[model samples]
Target: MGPGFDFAQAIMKKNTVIARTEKGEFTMLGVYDRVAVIPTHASVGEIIYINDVETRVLDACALRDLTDTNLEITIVKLDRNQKFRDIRHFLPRCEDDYNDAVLSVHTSKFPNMYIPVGQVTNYGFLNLGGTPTHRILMYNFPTRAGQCGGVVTTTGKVIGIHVGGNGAQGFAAMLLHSYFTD
Candidate 1:
């Protein structure tokens, strides 16, 4: 058994939210410690709409090389001000190993849902430096549109961020845990 089905349900209600910006509405990955992580592309430096409540963007950190277009994840610092609900300490995996089963929270529609059951199908790479960049591929993840910046996890451990997808096949920015520690 993995993080159980209810794990996704719990995360959807407490963590995830639809972030509306000048560009459009995108899924804002929920709070880990004090800030919410959102993609830099979707962030227009305007407004972050969460649950119909307006929030501010404090800062962002690029998880991948800025120049690389294949994939990127920007960890945004949200001005939550103790307003967002904090889940009981979910650890993030900085290492490469991940469970076959994964969960991804989606907030593309009015009623937020999640890919309660999915599996990491393959792992690929992008031309970066000497080592090449890594990407996680999953199947049966219904992250068709407007699902960017969503969170993907397994057994209470964050695996990656839902970057984009086509039909049942999806891609996420699967990188680290230490990135969030500092």
Candidate 2:
């Protein structure tokens, strides 16, 4: 499963989506309307075109396994879901320490665009790629693999969820607002 991570980023811009899915699919948020919140390494049916329309692999698998096993983040269940506005009423405080802090990772695949990462430096339970996830937010801001999942802002509200990275350093998957408040 290592080196299979492709890339994906959406949230809304008219439905929202991500490309490539053999083992790599990336989508980061869409709250609800149909669900949508990827990066659990895409399981289930596995066949998503998204912006071009194909759609499969519906997830909400029991609240997506408690946000991916006690909080790892994967939620996807969309055919359409707008992305922002009412981000579960804005989060980020449960252990808030952003360090150098500077996250604005939004993307409808670039247009109004939203990049500019950060550097939380490091947080805990390491073991990056080989997958041993647990309380990690190692942000040195190295995002590429389809830009994993995103929905983080700075002021005006944009709490968290942008987990996955390489080629530099990246990782962020803040409490899906406790599964968007159960």
**Cα lDDT of model 1 by residue, 41-107, tens digit:** 6744745676677877777665654456444666777776664565435745444545544545455
RMSD of each: 4.4, 15.1
Give the poorly placed runs of model 2, Cα more than 4 Å off: 1-49, 58-69, 75-112, 125-133, 138-148, 151-171, 174-182
- Please report the TM-score between candidate 2 and the true structure: 0.29
Q: What are the per-model numbers of colliding residue pairs?
A: 1, 6
Which lDDT tens digits does candidate 2 get at residues 53-134?
Answer: 6766555442334235434566656544443334455455464545334433334553333555554643645455666665
lDDT of each: 0.60, 0.51
Each prediction's TM-score versus the true structure: 0.73, 0.29
Give residue 14's lDDT in candidate 2 (0 to 100): 36
